[PDB]
Every structure is written in C-alpha cells, then in structure tokens.
Design a protein around this ligand. Structure first.
Ligand SMILES: *Cc1ccc(S(=O)(=O)N2CCNc3ccccc32)cc1
Ligand SMILES: *Cc1ccc(S(=O)(=O)N2CCNc3ccccc32)cc1
Ligand SMILES: [Ca+2]
Ligand SMILES: [Ca+2]
Ligand SMILES: [Ca+2]
Ligand SMILES: [Ca+2]
Ligand SMILES: [Cl-]
Ligand SMILES: [Cl-]
Lengths: 232, 9, 232, 9
C-alpha cells in the first residue's frame, strides 16, 4: 500500500524510532505497512503494532470523552458545533479501529498458530471492538458488544489450555476482558469474579518464575488489584 | 478502571 | 479552502473545543480556516491561532531533536533509515512553518495597524523563522536567520514606542528574541543583555498595574529570570 | 532556555 515501496526491516526500524520520538501516528503507519508485507510478526513486532495503535486510539478516546462530556452538558443552545465535532472525532476513531480489525482479519489471526500469537491478536480484536462499543449507539451496538465478547472468549479459552496462569498475555487478556465486563457489558460481578480468580491463580504460580518473569506477572497483578479496589 | 498499557511503564 | 464551507464563528468555536480535547492539529486547521475568511482577528482569536501552531510545531521540534540526537550518535552503520525519518519529520515541520508564515504574509500583518496586533504577528513571524533556523543547514540558513532577526527587530521597535514595558506581548517578544540571540544567532551576551534590561524595566513599571496585570507581567519576568539563571 | 508558552499555564 502506502508503505508498499519500503523494506519490511526499514518499516520496523522506523516504527521503533517513531516510538522514541513519540510520533505514534507515524508508528502505526509504519507497522500497518509492515503487517501488509504479509509475513507473520515476531513477539517484539506484535508489541510495536499494539503500542502504536493503542496510543493513537487512546488519544482519540480521551478526546471523544472530553467532547461527549461537553455535549451532554449542553443538552443554552450552542448550535450544532459540539455534536458535529464529537461526530468527527468519533468517525476518525471508528476508522482507526476498523483499520486494526482489518489487519487482524487480513490475515494476522488466521496465520497465527502458536498460542501466544493467536491469543495476542484475539485480545487485540476484543479491545478494538470494545473501543467501537464505547461510542456505539445505533442498530449495531449489541452486535459490536458481542463481537468483542466472542474474541475475548476465544482468547480466554486458548490461554487457559495453553499458557500458565502467570503468563503476561494471559493476565493482560483477563484484565482487559474484566474491563469489558464492567464498563461495556454491564456485568460488574463477572468483572470482579474474573479479576479475583485471575489474581489468585497467578499468585499461586509466582513460585515457578524467575526474577524477570515475576516482575512482569506482579505488575499486571497490581493492575488487577487496582481495578478490584476501584470496583469494591 | 485500567486496561493493559502498551509498555511496562 | 478546506474549511471554506464552515462559518467563521463555527471554526472559532471548534478551535476552542479542539484545545480542550488536546487536538492541536485540528485546532490549527480550524484557525487556518478562520484566518482564511479574510477578516482581522481579535485578541482572543490571535491567541487561539498561536496556541494551535505553537503546540503542533512544538511537538515536531521535540521529535526532530530526538531523531537528530540518534542520527548524530549513529555518525555501526544503521543504514539510511534514521536520516530518512529525521528528514521526513523535518520536511513536515518546515511545511507547518511555511503555512504559518503564509498566513502572516497573506494577509494578517499587512492589515494589522494597532500596535498590539502588529507586534503579536511580527513576534510570530520571528518565531516561525527561528524554528526554520533550528533545522537549517544549506544555502539559505543565513537568510532564514536574518528573516527571524528582521521580524523580531521590527516588533521590538514598535513595542518600545507604543507599549509599556510591562505589556505581556512586549515581554514575550523580548523573551523570544533573547532566545533567538542565545540559541540561533550565537550572541549570548546580546541575549543576556536583552533579558536583563527587559526584566529591570518591567520591574520598575509594576507599580502601575492592577493585580491581574501584575500577575501576567511577573509570570513572564520569571521566565526571563529562569533563562538568565541558566545562561549565567 | 524557555520561550513564551501558548497559555499562562
Ligand atoms: C496484552 C499484553 C500483555 C502483556 C504483554 S508483555 O509483552 O508481557 N508486556 C508488554 C506490554 N505491557 C506489559 C505490562 C506489564 C507486564 C508486561 C507487559 C503484551 C501484551
Ligand atoms: C507572545 C505573547 C505574550 C503574551 C501573551 S498573553 O495574551 O498576555 N498571555 C497568553 C499567552 N501566554 C502568556 C504567558 C504569561 C502571561 C500572559 C500570557 C500572548 C502572546
Ligand atoms: Ca503460522
Ligand atoms: Ca476504563
Ligand atoms: Ca486593520
Ligand atoms: Ca530553548
Ligand atoms: Cl467538525
Ligand atoms: Cl521515512
């Protein structure tokens, strides 16, 4: 495509430079170009792809929330501008989510056979449908929510069969799916139960880990605990 | 509530 | 142009919303559209224009500095990618500076007759030539530096004739011109002298000010003092 | 060295 004339290795190198320069839109474009080369991604490359788009959509989500709050307060007649601009940001956000979902569907997920890669991509699929669900209101909102649920569920089923309970991808997946239950699916008890069981099963497997693996698993356990403290 | 960050930081 | 079909007042309103949402590229596009309506800008509108572009170029400058530092360290052969990507960011930065300079030349400066508006725009002109000078290396670098100097000098001459020494635009102009002398023109003694004389003449006029004007003038005086502490 | 910020903050 747009990056079609640049070497895969140069796109990866430039994505790393873009992250150091905090140029996340560039980073996402370089990683989209890398995915479109058609080869599978390594662990490090999957993290570059996720970092790039998570930062781009994260900024859009924060702007959408600011605008949505102003719009709800307005509803003196300020005219159509707040709604129009919220709609503009919302369309942009939806476009980025559609782009990421399109990369996952063409063809990252179908080529991912190892449990670590397949879980990583299905967790991303759940996350980008979740971001679509945060702004959805029309006839497809139920279907968008169900698409997030289904992706997270398939990732959970693989992770519980193929990864230890301290694996950081398994932990991050459970963290994000618990956020889905609380914030999207109106299922706070499911969210709390998932976070608690995940935390406790990870705690019981920490004894198997090296110092560096322990650091990763306990970092995500603390995120689970932080949500549990907020929710209880 | 917080979701997973892109990097450990 | 691109915003040609949106009302002036809607562009201004959306620029204010974009700032609240930290969407500075949008903010700059809305303000470019407002300027292109052809009317003069009010004080508040001039500040929206400056905030928008100062934030956009400020991010580009920070990214260029990160990339330029990596490039200088590289000069193992990492291939052409660091230089190529620094060049990409540099071209983008130059393009934004050219856009702002084009708005000032067509036709903000020529229509600005009041000292406050004309000084504001000439200070901006000096700043965007200064940002071009930060990345310049070729046959035009001397001419770019001189263009910044000339704009700042004309602004200084008007400000000293028409504004009190505590006026915040006069103070910010002197602050920025002193940064020009230190960082661009290799004239640290001129930079120190300008900052000191500006600070002292403002101090001696604080007694004339209301509480709110005093707050503005002392805030910029502290910036002058912070630079003097760094430079001495 | 610092130049003028876009807003007082
Ligand atoms: C979804 C997910 C979960 C973990 C990882 S990681 O590679 O183990 N890693 C990098 C991303 N953030 C993070 C936080 C805490 C501990 C480890 C990580 C990647 C993706
Ligand atoms: C270049 C310049 C200088 C002052 C101003 S201002 O409108 O007085 N104002 C807003 C921008 N930043 C600022 C810092 C301290 C005190 C006042 C201000 C605008 C533009
Ligand atoms: Ca495969
Ligand atoms: Ca949340
Ligand atoms: Ca006029
Ligand atoms: Ca500086
Ligand atoms: Cl809009
Ligand atoms: Cl490039």
């Amino acid at each position: 495509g747009a990056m079609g004339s640049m070497e895969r290795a140069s796109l990866i190198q430039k994505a790393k430079l873009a992250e150091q320069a905090e140029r996340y839109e560039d980073m996402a474009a370089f990683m989209k170009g890398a995915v479109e080369k058609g080869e599978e991604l390594s662990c490090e490359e999957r993290n570059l792809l996720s970092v790039a788009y998570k930062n781009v959509v994260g900024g859009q989500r924060a702007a959408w929330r600011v605008l949505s709050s102003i719009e709800q307060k307005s509803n003196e007649e300020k005219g159509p501008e707040v709604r129009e601009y919220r709609e503009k940001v919302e369309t942009e956000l939806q476009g980025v989510c559609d782009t990421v979902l399109g990369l996952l569907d063409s063809h990252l997920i179908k080529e991912a056979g190892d449990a670590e890669s397949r879980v990583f991509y299905l967790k991303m699929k759940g996350d980008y449908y979740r971001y679509l669900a945060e702004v959805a209101t029309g006839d497809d909102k139920k279907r968008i929510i169900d698409s997030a649920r289904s992706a997270y569920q398939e990732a959970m089923d693989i992770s519980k069969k193929e990864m230890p309970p301290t694996n950081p991808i398994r932990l991050g997946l459970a963290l994000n799916f618990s956020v889905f239950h609380y914030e999207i699916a109106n299922s706070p008890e499911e969210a709390i139960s998932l976070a608690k069981t995940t935390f406790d099963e990870a705690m019981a497997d920490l004894h198997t880990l090296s110092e560096d693996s322990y650091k990763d698993s306990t970092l995500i356990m603390q995120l689970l605990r932080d949500n549990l403290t907020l929710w209880t | 509530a917080g979701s997973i960050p892109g990097r450990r930081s």
